[PDB]
Amino acid sequence: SQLLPIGSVVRLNNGDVNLMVISRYALYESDKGVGYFDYSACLHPSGVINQRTYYFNQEDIAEVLFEGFVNQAERNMQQIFEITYPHFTIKEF
Amino acid sequence: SQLLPIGSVVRLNNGDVNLMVISRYALYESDKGVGYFDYSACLHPSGVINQRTYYFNQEDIAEVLFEGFVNQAERNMQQIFETEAPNITYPHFTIK
Amino acid sequence: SQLLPIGSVVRLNNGDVNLMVISRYALYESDKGVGYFDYSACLHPSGVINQRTYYFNQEDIAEVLFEGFVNQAERNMQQIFETEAPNITYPHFTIKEFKEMND
Amino acid sequence: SQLLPIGSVVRLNNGDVNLMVISRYALYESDKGVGYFDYSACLHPSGVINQRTYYFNQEDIAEVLFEGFVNQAERNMQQIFETNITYPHFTIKEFKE
Fold first, then answer.
1. Best interface-test mutation with A: which of B40, B49, B50 has the largest number of A CBs within 10 A?
2. Any idea what the Cα angle at residue C20 is, between residues C24 and C72, rounded to 5°?
């Protein structure tokens, strides 16, 4: 249960806007190649109003402002969670 | 605060999946033209791992399983949502 | 038809790159709330190889280099633009209100 | 100098709506892995209003209703493009859902 559920609202260590988790273990094509982050996020509370997705990891989260829905499906999902692509950092993003 | 905040999880009438709200007053273009749906959502808890985006209105919601975050940023958008709601020129699409 | 159709390539005032309109009346979430710009734009001719989106208003266009497709679908949308333009409740953001990159 | 420039509005085979080219040689992640298409596009004339992105190849185009802006920058880019992504070339079948 190390990963946050989707809908969780967080703030990064160096950020003035709030993000909301929309996926876990999201892939990201980059100049180095196709890697993976821990989370993909949108801007809160505007939401998905464009194609701009934000990527970060748990180390980048400064404060979990709110945690998403955690029913038995989310509990079973994180159990299945516990990627061959490289692990990217926000600097790479 | 008539519209649910993003991150809320609901289920539509005769719906077989749990949908998590990701945007509100989402514009949708069809063959008829361009209209708006009250909400936009993705699958929970799988999330936005693809691009299968779901669109519905408030009258299509059967059960509100979870309510999203409500901070001061969300409260201010709800102030805009009251004045904007009766002034939306875009047509209102439906699921039917 | 005050707003340009999507695909229009313009150069902004004090600009350093070419931008193609990819949306009209785009919402922008800032640290001072959510507002709207007249256009959102990507880079020309590179396109959307990354997510470095540009935002501006009609008063920021220095020169319109190219106009996009104008079909009946685009004409039907401009019919909604004229009526909704004095009815947008969202606050009108300006480029000066934020960091003016590539400007 | 064969790829359509950005801003080109086309209709695909059995395409119920028109799409505007927003980028060329775009990577897309499928079950097989990371593959590339000839084009990535948004809906027309709504533009990029969400995270939805439409990917297709040149063989899927039924009609080019309109071609985007072409200048020496686009000509030099097409010359550069003619001058291979080392990725599998995906088809519109990878987008089953």
1. B49
2. 55
